[PDB]
Design an enzyme around this catalytic site. Structure first.
Site, PDB file in Angstrom:
ATOM      1  N   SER B  52       0.840  -1.200   0.000  1.00  0.00           N
ATOM      2  CA  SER B  52       0.000   0.000   0.000  1.00  0.00           C
ATOM      3  C   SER B  52       0.874   1.249   0.000  1.00  0.00           C
ATOM      4  CB  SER B  52      -0.865   0.038   1.250  1.00  0.00           C
ATOM      5  OG  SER B  52      -0.059  -0.101   2.413  1.00  0.00           O
ATOM      6  N   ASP B  94      -1.071  -1.475  -3.973  1.00  0.00           N
ATOM      7  CA  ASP B  94      -2.481  -1.344  -3.618  1.00  0.00           C
ATOM      8  C   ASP B  94      -2.947   0.128  -3.712  1.00  0.00           C
ATOM      9  OD1 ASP B  94      -4.827  -2.522  -2.711  1.00  0.00           O
ATOM     10  OD2 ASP B  94      -4.061  -3.043  -0.718  1.00  0.00           O
ATOM     11  N   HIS B 198     -12.954  -2.865   4.580  1.00  0.00           N
ATOM     12  CA  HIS B 198     -11.618  -3.191   5.098  1.00  0.00           C
ATOM     13  C   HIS B 198     -11.628  -3.366   6.619  1.00  0.00           C
ATOM     14  CE1 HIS B 198      -9.851  -1.154   1.317  1.00  0.00           C
ATOM     15  NE2 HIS B 198      -9.741  -2.464   1.195  1.00  0.00           N
ATOM     16  N   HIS B 238     -11.975  -6.856  -2.409  1.00  0.00           N
ATOM     17  CA  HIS B 238     -11.361  -6.089  -1.303  1.00  0.00           C
ATOM     18  C   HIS B 238     -12.026  -6.412   0.016  1.00  0.00           C
ATOM     19  CE1 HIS B 238      -8.723  -3.320  -3.653  1.00  0.00           C
ATOM     20  NE2 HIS B 238      -9.518  -3.764  -4.612  1.00  0.00           N
ATOM     21  N   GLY B 239     -11.293  -6.242   1.112  1.00  0.00           N
ATOM     22  CA  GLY B 239     -11.812  -6.597   2.421  1.00  0.00           C
ATOM     23  C   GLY B 239     -11.994  -8.101   2.532  1.00  0.00           C
ATOM     24  N   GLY B 240     -10.904  -8.830   2.313  1.00  0.00           N
ATOM     25  CA  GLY B 240     -10.920 -10.283   2.376  1.00  0.00           C
ATOM     26  C   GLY B 240     -10.961 -10.817   3.797  1.00  0.00           C
ATOM     27  N   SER B 241     -10.139 -10.239   4.669  1.00  0.00           N
ATOM     28  CA  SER B 241     -10.003 -10.720   6.043  1.00  0.00           C
ATOM     29  C   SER B 241     -11.363 -10.815   6.735  1.00  0.00           C
ATOM     30  CB  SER B 241      -9.084  -9.784   6.839  1.00  0.00           C
ATOM     31  OG  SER B 241      -7.822  -9.651   6.207  1.00  0.00           O
ATOM     32  N   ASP B 262      -5.303  -8.331   4.434  1.00  0.00           N
ATOM     33  CA  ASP B 262      -4.395  -7.496   5.205  1.00  0.00           C
ATOM     34  C   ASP B 262      -4.599  -7.674   6.709  1.00  0.00           C
ATOM     35  OD1 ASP B 262      -2.389  -5.614   5.718  1.00  0.00           O
ATOM     36  OD2 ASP B 262      -3.821  -3.933   5.698  1.00  0.00           O
ATOM     37  N   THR B 263      -5.786  -7.329   7.197  1.00  0.00           N
ATOM     38  CA  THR B 263      -6.041  -7.303   8.639  1.00  0.00           C
ATOM     39  C   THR B 263      -5.779  -8.649   9.331  1.00  0.00           C
ATOM     40  OG1 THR B 263      -7.659  -5.532   8.389  1.00  0.00           O
ATOM     41  CG2 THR B 263      -7.768  -6.847  10.400  1.00  0.00           C
TER      42      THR B 263
HETATM   43  O1  LIG Z   1      -8.425  -5.099   0.693  1.00  0.00           O
HETATM   44  C1  LIG Z   1      -7.449  -5.097   1.369  1.00  0.00           C
HETATM   45  C2  LIG Z   1      -7.443  -5.915   2.655  1.00  0.00           C
HETATM   46  O2  LIG Z   1      -8.659  -5.983   3.331  1.00  0.00           O
HETATM   47  P1  LIG Z   1      -8.641  -6.575   4.868  1.00  0.00           P
HETATM   48  O3  LIG Z   1      -7.771  -5.553   5.813  1.00  0.00           O
HETATM   49  O4  LIG Z   1     -10.167  -6.676   5.437  1.00  0.00           O
HETATM   50  O5  LIG Z   1      -8.030  -7.896   4.833  1.00  0.00           O
HETATM   51  N1  LIG Z   1      -6.336  -4.217   1.043  1.00  0.00           N
HETATM   52  O6  LIG Z   1      -6.426  -3.386  -0.081  1.00  0.00           O
HETATM   53  C3  LIG Z   1      -5.266  -3.987   1.987  1.00  0.00           C
HETATM   54  C4  LIG Z   1      -5.416  -2.815   2.951  1.00  0.00           C
HETATM   55  C5  LIG Z   1      -4.699  -1.505   2.620  1.00  0.00           C
HETATM   56  C6  LIG Z   1      -3.937  -0.844   3.766  1.00  0.00           C
HETATM   57  O7  LIG Z   1      -3.876   0.555   3.809  1.00  0.00           O
HETATM   58  P2  LIG Z   1      -2.547   1.295   4.453  1.00  0.00           P
HETATM   59  O8  LIG Z   1      -1.556   0.277   4.788  1.00  0.00           O
HETATM   60  O9  LIG Z   1      -1.956   2.371   3.335  1.00  0.00           O
HETATM   61  O10 LIG Z   1      -2.974   2.157   5.787  1.00  0.00           O
HETATM   62 NA    NA Z   2     -12.471  -7.137   5.804  1.00  0.00          NA
HETATM   63 ZN   LIG Z   3      -8.535  -2.966  -0.540  1.00  0.00          ZN
END
Ligand SMILES: O=C(COP(=O)(O)O)N(O)CCCCOP(=O)(O)O
Ligand code: NA
Ligand SMILES: [Zn+2]
Ligand SMILES: O=C(COP(=O)(O)O)N(O)CCCCOP(=O)(O)O
Ligand code: NA
Ligand code: NA
Ligand code: NA
Ligand SMILES: [Zn+2]
EC number: 4.1.2.13
Lengths: 329, 329
Positions: B52, B94, B198, B238-241, B262-263
């Site tokens: 990112s 990203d 996210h 997006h927002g897999g976690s 990510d999370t």
């Molecule tokens: O879609 C995702 C992950 O989604 P998730 O966090 O629910 O797994 N991503 O795009 C990853 C998250 C991006 C992070 O932003 P910064 O590090 O610049 O603050």
């Molecule tokens: Na999520």
């Molecule tokens: Zn994302």
């Protein structure tokens, strides 16, 4: 930028002439390399980043566990970052014993020789040969072959006579000077052991005798028919962490140009992470049915703190060694 | 190895044909990149590693704070590491909004374009333009120019229509095909918003309508004169976690080839570090006049646990997305 061989040689030459020395900071990762360079830059100083065999293996990751790969990967990372700072940063590899030469120093030397033959600069500017676990004659014999290879790659070799714990003799100093000369055969650094010890202990535990270094320069000077006050050796001080400021100043007087710091920077890195986890216990853990707090279990939140804390300890080392404000830039 | 543009296109091609998808793991450092790739390898899977804007800045160090430098340094590290694994790892950037295009995506596109013009491969295999915060027309006008630039560098552009929280329209799908085509003007991934958010929250808080994606595919197929079961779009989730098994599986049937995680991997990384600090509190801290315990405040001791834990979570994501065992190798 990364120190070219010419700049690195001038860094060490100026340090020697002016009785100061560079911290050599053991690094294992992108975060610790970043911390170390920011430290150097903050202190207005040039500096040395070094990777141990264990550190290089760590940097290659659990899926690889290969020293050369980890060393090369971390070096390539460092070349990009260092370009963005005005100070000079030299890359060094730390103790490599006999049974690791083939898997660490020799292949890294080969990579650099290849770069140099193409008109470029070596990936690393120095490598350490640690032969302190074999007799002085065997150690020096291996050193002589390594010195030929190092010279062709425009790399400085560091060698160790005597042992670092976890006191070099006058005759050992003479053998070394007889075998390797004063640098006509290529520049080398000498880690001679004066009571130094890896790790950090209740102060007073470790007994340093910097006078061993003074005597080594005198013996070498006499052998070379040089001035009594001459300093033919460029010394390295291993086990820098936990050392007294007065021990350090005395070693500087006798020609120490490089002092290795690992344990104190490790503690500096980790200390704020422990603190982050305790104060944020209920955000870094998912507790009482809650899902935790992303802002504090995001590794950057505590790793930035570790980085800053480690940099501040590096700035302190630059001041202990009197290289602060001395960058050749 | 790092995925060449051709095997990345093939990875995504086979994922699409067979209804599986790749985890795209956000990484900020050497340790997390190592964890991510070890995970892919452990799962017998190809994979995507992404940086990112914040991750890249972190990666450049506190003394730099420059996105391009960070991304480039982490990418050079990853190129060395990935070469030691049989699986293919694609590098992606990203979430880049409009105001950061000139400091992240465009400069990175130029770096890759230069490498390609000399007959090499791009440094990254995809870049994301996030125009979700501008009107869709302005979004797509910017995308058209980026896509020409991306394709010239052999890079896949990912774009976003609608919004990721912290549900895409029928005609937006048509506008997107209108503006960018179906890949003839260069391949692109489409992040369409079906209810993604996210971060990880309490179950039942995020409500997805994956059927929006089925409708997007069917609608574009019709506008393009293709059979009704054609899938002109390659979707990103997006927002897999903290997503449910049955929504993911539904989304995979509709052409999702990439799921961002990510999370959950951050929690997995941090969790053992927290544990380490608590159980070792009197070794990582110098307590009651003791000097601590170097074997537990050595960053490698806990970072190896962090990396292993992250790799296990990555293996889980590969199993959930059914790309496990599917490596093109
Ligand atoms: O879609 C995702 C992950 O989604 P998730 O966090 O629910 O797994 N991503 O795009 C990853 C998250 C991006 C992070 O932003 P910064 O590090 O610049 O603050
Ligand atoms: Na999520
Ligand atoms: Zn994302
Ligand atoms: O002289 C020093 C540093 O001494 P210090 O830790 O007292 O500061 N060094 O040479 C660094 C010690 C490296 C040991 O190898 P591992 O990576 O397996 O731990
Ligand atoms: Na050394
Ligand atoms: Na070495
Ligand atoms: Na010490
Ligand atoms: Zn040492």
């Amino acid at each position: 930028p990364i120190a070219t061989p010419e700049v690195y040689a001038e860094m060490l030459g100026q340090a020697k002439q002016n009785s100061y020395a560079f911290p050599a900071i053991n690094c294992t990762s992108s975060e610790t390399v970043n911390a170390a360079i920011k430290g150097f830059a903050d202190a207005g100083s040039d500096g040395i980043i070094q990777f141990s065999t264990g550190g290089a293996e760590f940097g290659s990751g659990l899926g690889v566990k290969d020293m050369v790969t980890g060393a090369v990967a971390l070096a390539e990372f460092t070349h990009v970052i260092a370009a963005k700072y005005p100070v000079n940063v030299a890359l060094h590899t730390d103790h490599c014993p006999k049974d690791k030469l083939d898997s660490y120093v020799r292949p890294l030397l080969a990579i650099s020789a290849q770069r140099v033959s193409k008109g470029g600069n070596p990936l690393f500017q120095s490598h350490m040969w640690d032969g302190s676990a074999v007799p002085i004659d065997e150690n020096l014999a291996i050193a002589q072959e390594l010195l030929k290879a190092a010279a062709a790659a425009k790399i400085i070799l560091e060698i160790e006579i005597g042992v670092v714990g976890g006191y070099t003799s006058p005759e050992d100093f003479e053998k070394t000077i007889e075998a390797l000369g004063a640098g006509e055969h290529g520049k080398y650094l000498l880690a001679a052991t004066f009571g130094n010890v890896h790790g950090v202990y209740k102060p007073g535990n470790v007994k340093l005798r910097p006078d061993i270094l003074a005597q080594g320069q005198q013996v070498a000077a006499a052998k070379l028919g040089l001035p009594a006050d001459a300093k033919p050796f460029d010394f390295v001080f291993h086990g820098g962490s936990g050392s007294l400021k007065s021990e350090i100043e005395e070693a500087l007087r006798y020609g120490v140009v490089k002092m290795n710091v690992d344990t104190d920077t490790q503690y500096a890195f980790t200390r704020p992470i422990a603190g982050h986890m305790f104060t944020n216990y209920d955000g870094v853990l998912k507790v009482d049915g809650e899902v935790g707090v992303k802002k504090v279990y995001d590794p950057r939140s505590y790793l930035k703190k570790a980085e800053a804390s480690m940099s501040q300890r590096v700035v302190q080392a630059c001041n202990d060694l009197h290289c602060a404000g001395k960058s050749l830039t």
